Ligand binder design. Structure first.
Ligand code: HEA
Ligand SMILES: CCCCC/C=C\C/C=C\C/C=C\C/C=C\CCCC(=O)O[C@H](COC(=O)CCCCCCCCCCCCCCCCC)COP(=O)(O)OCCN
Ligand SMILES: CCCCC/C=C/C/C=C/CCCCCCCC(=O)O[C@H](COC(=O)CCCCCCCCCCCCCCC)COP(=O)(O)OCC[N+](C)(C)C
Ligand SMILES: CCCCCCCCCCO[C@@H]1O[C@H](CO)[C@@H](O[C@H]2O[C@H](CO)[C@@H](O)[C@H](O)[C@H]2O)[C@H](O)[C@H]1O
Ligand SMILES: CCCCCCCCCCO[C@@H]1O[C@H](CO)[C@@H](O[C@H]2O[C@H](CO)[C@@H](O)[C@H](O)[C@H]2O)[C@H](O)[C@H]1O
Ligand SMILES: C[C@H](CCC(=O)O)[C@H]1CC[C@H]2[C@@H]3[C@H](O)C[C@@H]4C[C@H](O)CC[C@]4(C)[C@H]3C[C@H](O)[C@]12C
Ligand code: CUA
Ligand SMILES: [Mg+2]
Ligand code: NA
Ligand SMILES: [Zn+2]
Lengths: 514, 73, 43, 98, 49, 259, 105, 227, 58, 84, 79, 46, 144
């Protein structure tokens, strides 16, 4: 029974739970790597070794947080648990293929841990640019193990995207149009279309890197007429959509959490929120060379990528102001999930505004490849994707488990993590403006004060991550069983109770047309 | 005894919002004035003042006599 | 949300134990590696 | 130019596929493929909600084009009302043999 | 009935604040951390050449 | 008992065996490229092939033999297949992008010209034009197969499907022969890299497509298809037209414009 | 759309329906408190008389607590509404939440 | 170079850097103000027991919150793109200097007249002379004439690097097989420092750039002496 | 050839509680075990190969 | 462009069989003649050890590491020229 | 003709940040000119301008590799 | 069927809170310790 | 009374100020005296005692508005515990400095810093605003 239920699953809730467990374990790997980074940097000089071991830690930090923590938790964990329930479907369209998307991830993570054990690791940056990642400067198996880890994670998500798009399009009640599905379901659908179109282009690019490393092709080697810059275009053609894939399910959860704890039946401006997510998904494919403003591109190309990148602020601003309009007039319930969502709104807005600074290429010439970029994206990732995840996890934990957390401990955990991440990242803006580069294991002495404070911040967030583990243990150790939940008439995933039976919607909902 | 007067009972949330969005704006214009004054204008004036009578050869000679250069003793 | 009282209440002492074990499970193994870095490096 | 040898669905469909094809031929919808048309929804003329058990979830799109659907369990017994618009629904249980 | 916060909230707030200030002051001032502050108004420049 | 039309699949070992096959194939290629050994890679190819066979066998059991493909299930599988094709089109777009990037702006190492100095392209009017006629013809004959099947004509469905597969095989053997005859190789700079990796993944897909048509041929021989229900044949026909359209773009781009 | 008077008149009529049932009384009050207003005395009086027809003393008390709540920090509103309702409270024998000690935390 | 506790950009050494500082100030106030407007509008939504929970009409307010951001973006983009096309204008350099990136140091070639080239490596910390800056100084500085337009061309002979000097507003990637151009003009003499700005392996943190800006006649005699 | 799909429909619809991947009978069990053994065995071998490859061979 | 062919008003298999045997297979037969007329070996060009060709940055994982996968001795020189 | 050569002037054929083709074209033009002279017995001094421009712009290692490859018979540009 | 309900829809047992504490310590502690041991490994090599 | 996990699909009781009349009564089963008090409620409410009216309220509802909306001392516990664990963090940082970090580079020695500072002033590092601007080159001291 154990093996049939957990290794042979065809059930969306149990596969969802598999992905949340996987994602939590990866989150501890990515946290440790982040503390190794901040230990290296937390005083001047060398702690671990030179930039090779250091950038192996940095590279793995990114890949683990992106591909093994955030994507599995938002799309495989919350998407699998919530999407079928929110549309009254009895499971995903392809329940067995859904289980292979899950099981591709432990092999993909194994490959990445293999890359770091063999030779001297892949110390390439998560962008894996050649020629540093090619077979002369990174001879031996480490970068090929990295490429194959990304191939497996890519197939897992491409097949996941097919599953979600099909389920969302085909498995709603016959009366429900796509304009009567909840915002989280639209956020998963749009993220899945972004995955479907962007991951195959990354697959093409890293396959070309694999053949340049092992079959004597020269796609990116000028000796054969190749160009290292072509790899950058193909990687970033996927990498920009990838950041919107990381955040969109987060925006979908934030809309539900803000609506729910404002005591509202609906988010403000539902069709504006759908329009904003499709516009950000479409615009997110025509901006990628904002990662390439110092590579030597033409001036008119730099002008178009500056303008197109900026334009994304318009639909994004619609959603921020709509979340404010949803709080407007609410019966505000100051639950710990609500705190996470309010931290999200503020910290995402900070990071989006420093993104707007960077979109100006002439200023990005000075800010590129410095810590100002690191500060921009950790305000949207560590203080947007993570805070949306922690919001959704504390909100829906009683649905998944049937048990309640202690809300006082969860508020304490939010307070420690909010201090910790702002201590860590806020000073990196000053380090970036004054010129400290990225991917450095040590810095000129003038940069010491802000690196010291940033490192001290990272330990406060470590204390929060340890306390989170204790808070989950305490809930399972005390077994306070859920009785009633508020607002089920506009939150269908709760209406089958906590946790819902293994099979739900065996008899579909009744929805009439009129 | 005296009756109480009837108070306003309707649109109280909207009235509070109207009042404060305007005070939210008035701050932004009043902060803009200070941030322009304290940082941006100050910078323009620091650069204009520095270069007004700046003598680059005199600056070079001071550096040269302090022994900073490889190319000039 | 409303919920039943705990089926298996975790007293303050028991929370102190779970919190300490949890913090030690992260702190001790990393602490052991970092304490011994000079040893690994000088080889 | 042409001949036969290819089975038809009438000959060879089986299991649920056959059930759905035979029910459709009779104008019946036991597997809930079609959206039900609403009645005027008053207490005299409630929406009739079929079920194989003692309760079924209803979603009420109270006005055309609302994006918010209102969900609630409808139980066997007296008609119940949507808690947003009040339109009435009544469960009609039984079997899987309509 | 009074709950955990009514009975212990004042003590938790006062001791946690006291402890947090004490240990951060000690860490920041007593254990040899080099903050590298600005030399401006602090350092007397010395001949180097 | 459910009263929706969707398929609750029985719990299955194939997703796990497919996932492990992928670990064995990729760790296998790593051992082949770096540790001089093919062992792990043949174990992974074998288990990948076993997994595909049993999984798709099970889909035929579930559909043809157990009746779980109601119209709602079939409509999902339509979307699934269209989305899969779209992702394969984007995978080839990355190779076309690499081709045009390198050929539109040839660097000094190549002679600052396309084709590079020292490269002698195949003549596009010879075996490449033949391969074009072969795949176009096979798009006509699969269309005949589809109409015969809808018209309930078993014999002409099989005759047209066999013709389509024979042409698939003819293209594959013609390509294998052109690869052997070609005076440039995958190591001949970015011209050989683009040429062989883009036409080589296309050839892999012609092999996959042809395999899928052969599966449809044996299922048709076994009477699995009805004149109205035959999604496996439709999906293989859609994949086959995709392989033909990709060839047309490769022929115009790499063989013709790039000669 | 409508004037404040027309809005008020529609709610007075809603609650004045002689055979209003329990479901309709609760739907009406739980809908009305969603609006940006504290209901006029004349609406509350009609809801309280509906409580009487429905033999529900406790819901009449809860309605007076929701008036107080809807006023938020405008502490002058509730004492004014209780003033305006005193004739009806005395006629129906409705004690206020304060007279019952139900304002004590 | 940066100094301890620094918050903003290094002071401007070139007119283009000056322009960037003023454009940054213009942009940051916006950033300030939007951040502040949001934080504030947020705390306004969260500080009242009054409620209004029924459906709210969105069309009017969405016009405000699409059009006002669009105007703000245009107010940032106008000066932004003016600077972009300014830096791109033709300027007639007096000298061309090449730099090639390597693992891990830079070489410099000044080949307008003679064959002058040399390598430039970080001074190891154990060999710094008193007063010299840890990880910043180099053995052989890139001497250049002040107050003159200089064309720098940048490339690499191995992996990617990127050649940066923050106080001149410069960062140009160093890509093998490619020759990227930038211009450089210092308003003042002095020593202007930068650091390799694309991850390039084990000693990426330790291959800095130091420009030494002096009068033309000093530069000429230094050039002759370096042959 | 003859159309024996009705035969297979009876085989795969028999009420024997078998999952579909074992419902064809004992040959399914054999092919399942062969596949699972090669997958788990190969996975152990791949871990051995990581062990080997994690250390210098000098 | 309609093509130059031309029909409808009924449908399906019969027409697509007519296109298969009347247009598609004929075209394949014609191209097959065209190819098997320009077939047979062309005189290979002088070997020149161009540095953008015969790339070797890592030995191939088969053979002696220096031969491409479908190496043809007649027309594929090694980095040191044609085989003996 | 135009001595007091300081460095290579702006060339509208190559107005963007990538100057690779500027170096290559001048290198070709020089060597093409020098072949055209010498051959026809005329004077290589007329090719001087291309020489000064490519020496200014081209990395030493590119010039050195291209000169090695001309000597080896493996230079892929047409001269 | 399978077990349903709180504590039964998970691949780990919560029947005893101390055995659970041990399993959660092993699970999250192994993920957090791994990169420190990998770094130790890369340092010991050379 | 007693809410069971198995009643999740039934209408339920809730105290919240925005849904004042919940879907069921707080107590539905009545004792003999409670049945007599519900009959008495059919007559004039002026004849109910204050206790009877409170008993009827508490059969229909669990908490009053004043009760359900009460403020609490939880913030003291949250802020104090957060300070505690931020304080615990500085123990970790003390431990790391003592056992993990070695001596930082010799360029941070007081005499090095004084010499480096004068050399920064001699090269006029940031002379417009950031560094040398704050030095008085006439009086040879930091500007006031
Ligand atoms: C969640 C992921 C996410 C999001 C949403 C964004 C959003 C934006 N980002 Fe960024 N970005 C990253 C993740 C993301 N980014 C990552 C991961 C990298 C680098 C990774 C690496 O290099 O390793 C990066 C790098 C990056 C760069 C390259 C910097 C460089 O490397 O030199 C640039 C430059 O244009 C940029 C710009 C922006 C802009 C303009 C936005 C805007 O879309 C933000 C829009 C949002 C707001 C402005 C806030 C809310 C809006 C309002 C309140 C409306 C009104 C306001 C205005 C009209 C201004 N980002
Ligand atoms: C009709 C053609 C069909 C191809 C059949 C031939 C063998 C392999 C089949 C797979 C083809 C797929 C493309 C992979 C890349 C290279 C093969 C290109 C096609 C080919 O076969 O190229 C040959 C070279 O093959 C070589 O190196 C061969 C090296 C063989 C190893 C393949 C390497 C592994 C590829 C990794 C794939 C990763 C894919 C990721 C999926 C993405 C996830 C979303 C050309 O021979 P040549 O002697 O150089 O020149 C001819 C001279 N007379
Ligand atoms: C670049 C930066 C941009 C920043 C932009 C910020 C813009 C702020 C704009 C202000 C909007 C003004 C609306 C005030 C609403 C507050 C609550 C309220 O006051 O509720 C009511 C308003 O709601 C109605 O219906 C009318 C509309 C429906 C409900 C209310 C909708 C508006 C709420 C929007 C709140 C925005 C809050 C945060 C913004 C970031 C008031 O009652 P009425 O007299 O109309 O009833 C009469 C009944 N009728 C309709 C039948 C006639
Ligand atoms: C980046 C995340 C980690 C952050 C901080 C970790 C905080 C430290 C937890 C303590 O870890 C332990 O510390 C002891 C020292 O206090 C070590 O004992 C060492 O030192 C003792 C005292 O010198 C000897 O008795 C022991 O044998 C010797 O192992 C011990 O191995 C290590 O587990
Ligand atoms: C449950 C079923 C699935 C599990 C199967 C597990 C299989 C384990 C067998 C592997 O052993 C072999 O050892 C060979 C000989 O020792 C190796 O050849 C390698 O090493 C040789 C000796 O140095 C070289 O000569 C070879 O060329 C080189 O390929 C090669 O790695 C591998 O074939
Ligand atoms: C044996 C069978 C009669 C088919 C049936 O059971 O109806 C016939 C019908 C169509 C025939 C096939 C088609 O005519 C196409 C092919 C023609 C080749 O000459 C023989 C193999 C070939 C693939 C045929 C084999 C066999 O004779 C088939 C399969
Ligand atoms: Cu060179 Cu980084
Ligand atoms: Mg860069
Ligand atoms: Na360091
Ligand atoms: Zn309704």
């Amino acid at each position: 029974m154990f093996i049939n239920r957990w290794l042979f699953s065809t059930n969306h809730k149990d596969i969802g739970t598999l992905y949340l467990l996987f994602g939590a374990w990866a989150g501890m790997v990515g946290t440790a790597l982040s503390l190794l980074i901040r230990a290296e940097l937390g005083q001047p000089g060398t702690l671990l070794g030179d930039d090779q071991i250091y950038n192996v830690v940095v590279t793995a930090h990114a890949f683990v947080m992106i591909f093994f923590m955030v994507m599995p938790i938002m799309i495989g964990g919350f998407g699998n648990w919530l999407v079928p329930l929110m549309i009254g479907a009895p499971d995903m369209a392809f329940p067995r293929m859904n289980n292979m998307s899950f099981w591709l991830l432990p092999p993909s993570f194994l490959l990445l841990l293999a890359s770091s054990m063999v030779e001297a690791g892949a110390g390439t940056g998560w962008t894996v640019y050649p020629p540093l990642a090619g077979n002369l400067a990174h001879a031996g198996a480490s970068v090929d193990l990295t490429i194959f880890s990304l191939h497996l994670a890519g197939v897992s998500s491409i097949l996941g995207a097919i599953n979600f798009i099909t389920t969302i399009i085909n498995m709603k009640p016959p009366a429900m149009s796509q304009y009567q599905t909840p915002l989280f379901v639209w956020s998963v659908m749009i993220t899945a279309v972004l995955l479907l179109l962007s991951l195959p282009v990354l697959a093409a690019g890293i396959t070309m890197l694999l053949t340049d490393r092992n079959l004597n092709t020269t796609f990116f080697d000028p000796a054969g007429g190749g160009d290292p810059i072509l790899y950058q275009h193909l990687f970033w053609f996927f990498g920009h959509p990838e950041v919107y894939i990381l955040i969109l399910p987060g925006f979908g959860m934030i809309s539900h959490i803000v609506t729910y704890y404002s005591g509202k039946k609906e988010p403000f401006g539902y069709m504006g929120m759908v329009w904003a997510m499709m516009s950000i998904g479409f615009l997110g494919f025509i901006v990628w060379a904002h990662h390439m403003f110092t590579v030597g591109m033409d001036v008119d190309t730099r002008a178009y990528f500056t303008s197109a990148t900026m334009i994304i602020a318009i639909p994004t601003g619609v959603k921020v102001f709509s979340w404010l309009a949803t709080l407007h007039g609410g019966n505000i319930k100051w639950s710990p999930a609500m705190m996470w969502a309010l931290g999200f709104i503020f910290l995402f807005t900070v990071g989006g505004l420093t993104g707007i600074v960077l979109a100006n290429s002439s200023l990005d010439i000075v800010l590129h490849d410095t810590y100002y970029v690191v500060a921009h994206f950790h305000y949207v990732l560590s203080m947007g994707a993570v805070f949306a995840i922690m919001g959704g996890f504390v909100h829906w934990f009683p649905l998944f488990s049937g048990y309640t957390l202690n809300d006082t401990w969860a508020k304490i955990h939010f307070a420690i993590m909010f201090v910790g991440v702002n201590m860590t990242f806020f000073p990196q803006h000053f380090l970036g403006l004054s010129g400290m580069p990225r991917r450095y294991s040590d810095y000129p002495d003038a940069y010491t004060m802000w690196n010291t404070i940033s490192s001290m911040g990272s330990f406060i967030s470590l204390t929060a991550v340890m306390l989170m583990v204790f808070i989950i243990w305490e809930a399972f150790a005390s077994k306070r069983e859920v009785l009633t939940v508020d607002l089920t008439t506009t939150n269908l995933e709760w209406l089958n109770g906590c946790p819902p039976p293994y099979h739900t919607f065996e008899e579909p909902t009744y929805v009439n047309l009129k | 005894s005296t009756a109480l007067a009837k108070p306003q009972m309707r649109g109280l949330l909207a009235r509070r919002l109207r009042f404060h969005i305007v005070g939210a704006f008035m701050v932004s214009l009043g902060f803009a004035t200070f941030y322009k004054f304290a940082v941006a204008e100050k910078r323009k004036k620091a650069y204009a003042d520095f270069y007004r009578n700046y003598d680059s050869m005199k600056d070079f000679e001071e550096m040269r006599k302090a022994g900073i250069f490889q190319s000039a003793k | 949300i409303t919920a039943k009282p705990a089926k298996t209440p975790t007293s303050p002492k028991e929370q102190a134990i779970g919190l300490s074990v949890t913090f030690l499970s992260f702190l001790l193994p990393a602490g052991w590696v970092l304490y011994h870095l000079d040893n690994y490096k000088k080889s | 130019a042409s001949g036969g040898g290819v089975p038809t669905d009438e000959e060879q469909a089986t299991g649920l596929e056959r059930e759905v094809m035979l029910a459709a031929r009779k104008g019946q919808d036991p597997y809930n493929i079609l959206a039900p048309k609403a009645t005027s929804g008053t207490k005299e003329d409630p929406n009739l909600v079929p079920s194989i058990t003692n309760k079924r979830i209803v979603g009420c799109i109270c006005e055309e084009d609302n994006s918010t659907v209102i969900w609630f369990w409808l139980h066997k017994g007296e008609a119940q009302r949507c808690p947003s618009c009040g339109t009435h629904y009544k469960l009609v249980p039984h079997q899987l043999a309509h | 009935a009074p709950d955990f916060h009514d009975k212990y909230g004042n003590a938790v707030l006062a001791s946690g604040a006291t402890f947090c200030v004490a240990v951060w002051v000690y860490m920041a001032t007593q254990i040899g951390i080099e903050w590298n502050p600005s030399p401006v108004g602090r350092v007397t420049p010395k001949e180097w050449r | 008992h459910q009263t929706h039309a969707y398929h609750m699949v029985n719990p299955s070992p194939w997703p796990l065996t497919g996932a492990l096959s992928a670990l064995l194939m990729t760790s296998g290629l790593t051992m082949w490229f770096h540790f001089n050994s093919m062992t792990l890679l043949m174990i992974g190819l074998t288990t990948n092939m076993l997994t595909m066979y049993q999984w798709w066998r099970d889909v035929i059991r579930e559909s043809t033999f157990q009746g779980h493909h109601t119209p709602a299930v079939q409509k999902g599988l339509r979307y699934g297949m269209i989305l899969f094709i779209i992702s394969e089109v984007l995978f080839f777009t990355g190779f076309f992008w690499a081709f045009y990037h390198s050929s539109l702006a040839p660097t000094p190492e190549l002679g600052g010209c396309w084709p590079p100095t020292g490269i002698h392209p195949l003549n596009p009017l010879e075996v490449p034009l033949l391969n074009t006629s072969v795949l176009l013809a096979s798009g006509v004959s699969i269309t005949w197969a589809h109409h015969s099947l809808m018209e309930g004509d078993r014999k002409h469905m099989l005759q047209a499907l066999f013709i389509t597969i024979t042409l698939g095989v003819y293209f594959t053997l013609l390509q294998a022969s052109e690869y052997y005859e070609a005076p440039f190789t995958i190591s001949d700079g970015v011209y050989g890299s683009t040429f062989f990796v883009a036409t080589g993944f296309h050839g892999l897909h012609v092999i996959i497509g042809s395999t899928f048509l052969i599966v449809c041929f044996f299922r048709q021989l076994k009477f699995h298809f009805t004149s109205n229900h035959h999604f496996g044949f439709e999906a293989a026909a859609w994949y086959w037209h995709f392989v033909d359209v990709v060839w047309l773009f490769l022929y115009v781009s790499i063989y013709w414009w790039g000669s | 759309h409508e004037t404040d008077e027309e809005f008020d008149a529609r709610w007075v009529t809603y609650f004045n329906k002689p055979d209003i049932d329990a479901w309709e009384l609760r739907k009406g009050m739980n809908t009305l408190v969603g609006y940006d207003l504290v209901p006029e005395p004349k609406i509350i009086d009609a809801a309280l008389r509906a409580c009487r027809r429905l033999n529900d003393f406790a819901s009449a008390v809860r309605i007076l607590e929701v008036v107080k709540d809807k006023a938020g920090p405008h502490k002058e509103i509730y004492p004014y509404v209780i003033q305006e309702l005193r004739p009806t409270l005395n006629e129906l024998g409705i004690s206020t939440p304060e007279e019952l000690g139900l304002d004590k935390v | 170079m940066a100094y301890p506790m620094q918050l903003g950009f290094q002071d401007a050494t070139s007119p283009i850097m000056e322009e960037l500082l003023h454009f940054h100030d213009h942009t940051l106030m916006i950033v300030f103000l939007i951040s502040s407007l949001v934080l504030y509008i947020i705390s306004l939504m969260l500080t009242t027991k009054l409620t209004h929970t029924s459906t709210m009409d969105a069309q009017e307010v969405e016009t405000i919150w699409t059009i006002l951001p669009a105007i703000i973006l245009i107010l940032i983009a106008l000066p932004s793109l003016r600077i972009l096309y300014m830096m791109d204008e033709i300027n007639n350099p007096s000298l061309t200097v090449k730099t090639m990136g390597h693992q891990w140091y830079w070489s410099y070639e000044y080949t307008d007249y003679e064959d002058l080239s040399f390598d430039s490596y970080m001074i190891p910390t154990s060999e710094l002379k008193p007063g010299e800056l840890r990880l910043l100084e180099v053995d052989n500085r890139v001497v250049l004439p002040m107050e003159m337009t200089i064309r720098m061309l940048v490339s690499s002979e191995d992996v990617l690097h990127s050649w940066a000097v923050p106080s001149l507003g410069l960062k140009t990637d160093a890509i093998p097989g490619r020759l990227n151009q930038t211009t450089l003009m210092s308003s003042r003499p002095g020593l202007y420092y930068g650091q390799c700005s694309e991850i390039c392996g084990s000693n990426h943190s330790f291959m800095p750039i130091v420009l030494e800006l002096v009068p033309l006649k000093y530069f000429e005699k230094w050039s002759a002496s370096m042959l | 050839f003859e159309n024996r799909v009705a035969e297979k429909q009876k085989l795969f619809q028999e009420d024997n509680g078998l999952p579909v991947h074992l419902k064809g009978g004992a040959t399914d069990n054999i092919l399942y075990r062969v596949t699972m053994t090669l997958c788990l065995g190969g996975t152990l071998y791949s871990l051995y190969c990581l062990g080997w490859a994690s250390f210098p061979h000098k | 462009a309609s093509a130059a062919k031309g029909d409808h008003g009924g449908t399906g298999a019969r027409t697509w069989r007519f296109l298969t045997f009347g247009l598609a297979l004929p075209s394949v037969a014609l191209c097959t003649l065209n190819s098997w007329l320009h077939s047979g070996h062309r005189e290979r060009p002088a070997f020149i050890p161009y540095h953008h060709l015969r790339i070797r940055t890592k030995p191939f994982s088969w053979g002696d590491g220096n031969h491409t996968f479908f190496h043809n001795p007649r027309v594929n020189p090694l980095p040191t020229g044609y085989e003996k | 003709k135009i001595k007091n050569y300081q460095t290579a002037p702006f060339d509208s054929r190559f107005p963007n940040q990538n100057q690779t083709r500027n170096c290559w074209q001048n290198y070709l033009d020089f060597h093409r000119c020098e072949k055209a002279m010498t051959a026809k017995g005329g004077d290589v001094s007329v090719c001087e301008w291309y020489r000064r421009v490519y020496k200014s712009l081209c990395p030493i290692s590119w010039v050195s590799t291209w000169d090695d490859r001309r000597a080896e018979g493996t230079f892929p540009g047409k001269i | 069927h399978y077990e349903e309900g709180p504590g039964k829809n998970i691949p780990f047992s919560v029947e005893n809170k101390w055995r659970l504490l041990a399993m959660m310590t092993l699970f999250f502690g192994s993920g957090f310790a791994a990169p420190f041991f990998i770094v130790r490994h890369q340092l010991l090599k050379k | 009374s007693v809410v069971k996990s198995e009643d999740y699909a039934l209408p339920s009781y809730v105290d919240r100020r925005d849904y004042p009349l919940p879907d069921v009564a707080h107590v539905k089963n009545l004792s003999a005296s409670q049945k007599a008090l519900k009959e008495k409620e059919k007559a004039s409410w002026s004849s109910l005692s204050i206790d009877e009216k409170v008993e009827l309220y508490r059969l229909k509802f669990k908490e009053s508005f004043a009760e359900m909306n009460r403020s609490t001392n939880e913030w003291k516990t949250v802020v104090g515990a957060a300070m505690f664990f931020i304080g615990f963090t500085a123990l970790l940082l003390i431990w790391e400095k003592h056992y993990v970090y070695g001596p930082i580079p010799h360029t941070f020695e007081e005499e090095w810093v004084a010499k480096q500072t004068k050399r920064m002033l001699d090269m006029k590092v940031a002379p417009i605003q950031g560094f040398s601007a704050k030095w008085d080159y006439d009086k040879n001291e930091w500007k006031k």
